Design a protein around this ligand. Structure first.
Ligand SMILES: *C(=O)CCCCCCCCCCCCC
Ligand SMILES: *C(=O)CCCCCCCCCCCCC
Lengths: 41, 604, 604, 604, 41, 72
């Protein structure tokens, strides 16, 4: 967790972070991208 | 527009045949229609996300803009000169072949790169369930971190780049809200790159989950149109192909199946014994057809399959009648002159072929398992073929014993090894079997309530019955799945049936005192268990004597209901019992909050 | 915008009422939003492709431009006057109803046309696997052609139009690269109309196949939200409906199931015999309840099903005790006064109803199979109904024998035909059964590690256990499928569990010398086999005494991990073992190149 | 573009750093790309539809325009400053976080609202199958209505708002055509809001159903790429993970399985008996290894599983040899010095551990079922672990009896309880087993035609064979499903094989008189049953001695054919037997028209 | 394979054609076209 | 300049290893006079020997161009 500083806009051990799940926003990237023949073109 | 872009050959105006694909050394420019940019953008978007980890580890090469693989050509874009002429596009955005190659191998190369890191980020992320589905629940960050500082095994990648993975993470888990730099406090809202998608997956308390209930429907709709559940009780010849019978090899236990319970299996019900002989491999053996009726697999009405009669664990009393020992058990065909069930004595049996004997007598195949010597699991096995039995009116497959010397001891034995678990496997799907005949088409409606209790369980692997069972079974999972045929909600399924019972019980009341006005509260409830009994055991609808379900209306009715029922579910079908379902989710988040509370204390 | 287009019927001022679906002589113009043109274009595009075969065979009628079915009207387009008012579209592209009819029946008529040819092109194309997945591999064209000139059966359509099918083909198989006319050489690149799609399906060596790995994920995501794998170990009442129990009729072998191993089956454990009588069809028979305990299906705790006790292949010793022969085997209910397991003698048994006898005594149902006469496969069968047993505190279903005259011979026999394979089929899904009681809701978490080894395999078709097993089974295929719980990759699944073991083993260490600092290398590995043992045999998580898996945390934990795990797979999840997977694909292309080499020699 | 919108925080000059997610009091504006508006519009469109029911019941709040949740900001929109710099969008349409919240909870709240009504509308709509699939068929409206006025149970919502539900309905069922106000007659055409979608689902008589045939293909394509059917007979090491083995616990019946038919099970084939002793729980018992060979589960070659040997319904002759009674049946390991199958007498058996005994002797576990006392269904069960047997060259699991006192009576008994149904469940997927060894990778091609008839059915739960069977089984359902391997259509599957047989039979003819020019009509037909026999029983392709199917070419061939075959089906694949399929649909509509005719009379 | 000439831009027996699969372009047409109710509109 | 030369150094160190098992797999180095070996054969030969997991079979004249600069 050693301080970095600019590489990325947020420090991990940074001031006032906060792990806190909300039933409201179910974390998700993009897995189901459609590529099948008919659907991709 | 769509397809490759085309400009004419001779020049001037472009008349069909005057237009050829504008092939270039790089390749042919194919048009990038609006939606197809959504994909390549959605793919690149998911890669750019990992920007902070690409720089950290000096891989990558800057953010991948989809505008680096395309171009701004203009011409007519279609699939063929003729139709491309009706799509004059100006300064459209096309991607040349050689480019369609990089945007491909780039998204592929980068995809590996991230696929790896993305795996480390995960073993650490999910390693503290950042996802609840009712209300909230925090877990003081210090602890959390100082905790994973432990658990995470020394070869992750979340220990070598904490806030190089954290920055990637913040965009995938709206659970981790980074503390704002100029107020040094969270944000209430969480802004992960998947802003919308993640909003529309949360288990919304009003109705289960839109992403769920939506698919469970489109999924069922697929099947309904696919297999051909529609037309499930159609009354007219249908090619077996229409039933896509696959992976279908059912096994039995004959020498038990009554002849009338399944046409493909006749029996030698004759007074005395019918000892015959046959020179097999020099040695002369005697097929018995002993004391009892000895049910044998008939050959006609037997779709050229792969019969594999297994004889194992089954008793082998060579201990008593010594006559039994010494005889090599073997599946043998038996061509009889007079039709079986009319074949009295030996002179009646034309010939007997040992289609597959077992090397080594009955005293090496044995194995003592507490007195009663059993059969060492072995599989005898013919490969019956429709035409190898051409002309031959009577012929039967029999997995008997082939005694090397009949005696008084084997006078009440009857060596039929058919008590074993035989497994026929139709090796030629195109041809089915029904009521004892081989056909190429079924008549669905005919097979409904036409089999008996066991004229079903005794069906022959890939025969109408087994096909008109594999079919109902799909339709049975579409209702079971999508429709709510398992609650007091008088659903579309049990509703289609109720309307039949009414229209039915209503005309049966027409003519005569009509002393009984139709019920309805009783009809709704009777049809509810009818539709329910179906989802339950799809098969039943084939057995003669099943209430409601077996009248010609139903099924033909049911399906076409369930049909339109799926094509309207809405999206919030999940509203069903979305109350207890909700209350159960809060139940979990309360217990998971309890977990975070320890992570929060133990590792302060 | 979307929906049908509306226009101010009252003219000029368009308010939420001065609108009206602009219908007319053509039907109603429905708007053709951007994406919906992608489909009809993608559909027509796939037809135009077959242009060279339409002219050759004088069918068709020119290329189908989607711009022939639409129009350029303008007005407000919504689903209802109210909301259509907020979508003023000018010169949008709408397709009138009567047109939405042709673009339909045209794409349908043409679709048949091509579907046919397209089938001939194929039996010839795939008839030489034009698809490899690692590196390249040619096959000198002359040979290839001169070869198919043979194989192809005389009724194809690729022999009547070679380079009329070839031109269609070149656009579907980037394997066949036509030789350019003005340099008479190939092109390196292959330009098939499916330029992009075909590029994005190639098994990219970096990560298996984007089209694969992508779907295997969205597929799992569907289930995860659908069935309701989430909430899998929720601790609170849940309607059976929430478990979509369908096609669920399990079969057993009672008269073996211990009474304590499954509440729905009590036994008459009494000293002597309990010969009772009953006039059935005139004739008076004696139910036995012989020497042993005679386990009988209890009626209460028996969800109104369709009990069908099959009695076949099972021994029938009418040979010894002649008493047994002559008695028609039959499933019979038995109402007892004092509760069973307290019912001593005949005067205790209130009444006995033959709910289903077998016509013809025990000497026609037999069939000699080597001394030991078996039972000709037959199915006795009641249709128990919750309320037909109202009030009646004690009543049991028993598939006994009904001896026409008890004797000394049958003094150690005990005619329970329950040794047969009974098959109960819940005929009314809404109601489940648990621990002996009938309910309408389960409490998942309760059924975990609460059954014993066999208090599971002895479950009653559609009872909590069988439901809390059908559920885990889905969640078991989502992990088995999507997540890599079968390699040393400490995946998201086995990771969610590890965090529980830590937090758990960590507080159990709190208070007292804490001489053991948590392990982790040992915890990771212990939780790996825990998550693995689950995917393996989903059931286990119900049996008392299973390491890790049965602690309240896990599962509730696992799923919610596996959950978020699927919602992030990326696309290149296939990077897992994409090395040996790749090396195996090159292995195949090397062997397939070997094939083309013979096609290349034999047919020079 | 896509992602959140950014703007030059440093003003004017927008570089790859002078940007910053434009967040604020509303959250972060995320861009709403063209297609993502299709969804939220398609979702809101399906809600607006229910407008007439929202006013009627004073809920709702006016029509939901998607233009109420968005905005018209402008800036650069990407996933990260770097890539967002290449998407300058002006006056794009973004939805702020707090808005992405309402459009969410609104569509959710409204979704509940309608989900409910929408359910009532249905139990009434489908309650008269408004969907036929061939030709038309009316049902005079008066009757219809006056009829449902009955059936519909008093708690619907279609009785409280008839033409408040009717107006919602008219837009979902193009069956109900409302009578036009100013000509008081129908309309011929039906204009339901789902105008297009409903047009493209009708079972078009040319080809089954586009919505069906389309999916049944994309569905198969998913699998083909997913599981990894491609590479199905690859000849090279493949991680077991590549086979996603899940929910895989197979059960047997050893003490029957020949030792050579399955390496994981050796037998003590020794002359006399081998009575050994062992102090178990104080009391001294004698393991027997009786008269017969007593096949025992070998421990090496036994993937640390969960062996659970069930002993029930199986005979228990404590009646004759009294020696048997009193002995607690129990699964026991047996470490032998000299390798088994070479272990002659007691002094040879190193030690014997009772890994799991059954409390209570053999006279409480019994239960008389007609003379022959059976075993009360009980499950003994070890938890074998790879390394608990480290070093130990010879050790075997044996479910024997443990007699408390061997006698002359048990001199021909042999107490192996292995005749029971043992169920091994691999508890650690990563490791597989092949030919007796434990591995981490299979070599597919090796397992083809390498097992014997029963060297397959005797496979050990999660062993190469069982894995190279679970795999073919998927590929078997892709062909069975998508491809027409069940009609005389010489499909792409049976076609890929035919080309192999030719190339094969053609070179075997090279060199020597070549008196036989290849056949082809006979080859096509031989390969048709080969591809067919595969779809039928996928397994066979593992057994030595199966025509065609087991030559190295096929399969590796088949799949790669079936592969490209699915990636071209077109859409109208349903044209296959779309004639009888059509004729069957007309058959149903003729019978359903018959129904409407009664609804039309009975309730005039 | 008899020469045609113009019907289609390529002769089959034409000069220098070339069957040659590339793991790179898996042949593909358009089968998975989406038409389901919700998705087609 | 350090971690780049390091990251890139890995990248090449790998390929550079495949190029080699194929290059030295035909001693491109003599130390007295010359000696050729008709290219066709040479190539068609290594097309064999080289084990299926090299990287000189996946990029022939993508490795060849790197090679030409290391083997005179
Ligand atoms: C410094 O690296 C100390 C360890 C703190 C974080 C290491 C990784 C564990 C936390 C992950 C944060 C990013 C997403 C999980
Ligand atoms: C003339 O027609 C001789 C036969 C050569 C081609 C016939 C069909 C076989 C080759 C197919 C080419 C088009 C796609 C397979």
């Amino acid at each position: 967790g050693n301080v970095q500083t600019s590489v990325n806009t947020y420090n991990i051990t940074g001031d006032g972070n906060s792990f806190t799940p909300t039933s409201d926003m179910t974390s998700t990237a993009a897995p189901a991208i459609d590529l099948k023949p008919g659907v991709l073109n | 527009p769509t397809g490759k872009l085309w400009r004419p050959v001779g020049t001037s105006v472009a008349t069909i045949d005057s237009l050829a694909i504008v092939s270039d050394r790089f390749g042919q420019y194919s048009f990038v229609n609006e939606g197809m940019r959504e994909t390549f953008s959605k793919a690149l978007f998911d890669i750019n996300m990992w920007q902070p980890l690409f720089q950290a580890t000096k891989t990558g090469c800057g953010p991948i803009v989809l505008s680096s693989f395309t171009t701004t050509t203009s011409g007519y874009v279609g699939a063929t000169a003729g139709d491309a002429l009706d799509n004059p596009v100006t300064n459209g955005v096309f991607i040349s072949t050689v480019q369609i190659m990089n945007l491909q191998r780039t998204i592929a190369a980068r995809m590996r790169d991230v696929a790896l890191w993305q795996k480390h980020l995960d073993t650490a992320m999910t390693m503290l369930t950042p996802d609840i589905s009712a209300g909230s629940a925090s877990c003081n960050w210090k602890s959390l971190l100082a905790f994973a500082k432990d658990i995470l095994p020394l070869d992750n990648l979340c220990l070598t780049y904490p806030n190089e993975f954290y920055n990637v993470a913040i965009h995938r888990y709206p659970a981790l809200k980074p503390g704002n730099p100029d107020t040094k406090l969270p944000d209430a809202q969480a802004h992960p790159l998947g802003e919308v998608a993640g909003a529309f997956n949360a288990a919304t308390s009003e109705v289960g989950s839109l992403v769920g209930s939506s698919s469970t429907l489109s999924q069922a709709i697929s099947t309904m149109a696919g297999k051909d559940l529609d037309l499930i009780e159609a009354d007219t010849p249908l090619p077996v192909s229409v039933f896509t019978p696959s992976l279908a090899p059912r096994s039995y236990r004959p020498a038990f199946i009554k002849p009338e319970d399944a046409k493909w299996i006749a029996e030698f019900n004759n007074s005395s014994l019918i000892r015959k002989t046959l020179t097999y491999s020099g040695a002369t053996y005697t097929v018995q057809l002993g004391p009892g009726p000895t049910r044998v697999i008939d050959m006609n009405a037997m779709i050229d399959s792969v019969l594999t009669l297994d004889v194992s664990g089954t008793i082998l009393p060579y201990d008593t009648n010594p006559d039994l020992s010494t005889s090599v058990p073997a599946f043998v065909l038996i061509q009889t002159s007079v039709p079986i069930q009319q074949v009295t004595t030996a002179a009646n049996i034309t010939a007997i072929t040992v289609v597959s004997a077992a090397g080594a007598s009955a005293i090496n195949l044995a194995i003592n398992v507490r007195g009663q010597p059993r059969f060492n699991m072995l599989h005898l096995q013919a490969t019956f073929e429709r035409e190898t039995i051409t002309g031959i009116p009577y012929i039967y497959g029999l997995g008997t014993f082939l005694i090397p010397s009949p005696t008084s001891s084997s006078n009440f034995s009857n060596p039929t090894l058919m008590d074993g678990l035989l497994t026929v496997t139709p090796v030629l799907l195109r041809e089915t079997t029904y009521k004892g005949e081989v056909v190429d088409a079924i008549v669905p409606a005919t097979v409904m309530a036409n089999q008996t209790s066991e004229e079903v369980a005794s069906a022959l692997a890939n025969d109408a019955i087994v096909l008109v069972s594999n079919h109902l079974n799909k339709l049975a999972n579409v209702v079971g799945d999508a429709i709510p045929v398992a609650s007091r909600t008088d659903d579309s399924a049990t509703s289609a049936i109720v309307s039949r019972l009414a229209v039915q019980h209503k005309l049966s009341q027409v003519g005569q005192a009509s002393p009984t006005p139709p019920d309805y509260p009783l009809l709704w409830r009777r049809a509810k268990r009818a539709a329910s009994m179906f989802v339950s055991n799809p098969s039943l609808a084939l057995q003669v004597g099943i209430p409601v379900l077996t009248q010609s209306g139903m099924l033909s009715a049911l399906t076409s209901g369930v049909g339109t029922a799926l094509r309207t579910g809405s999206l919030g079908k999940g509203v069903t019992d979305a109350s207890e379902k909700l209350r159960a989710r809060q139940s979990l988040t309360v217990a998971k909050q309890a977990f975070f509370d320890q992570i929060g204390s133990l590792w302060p």
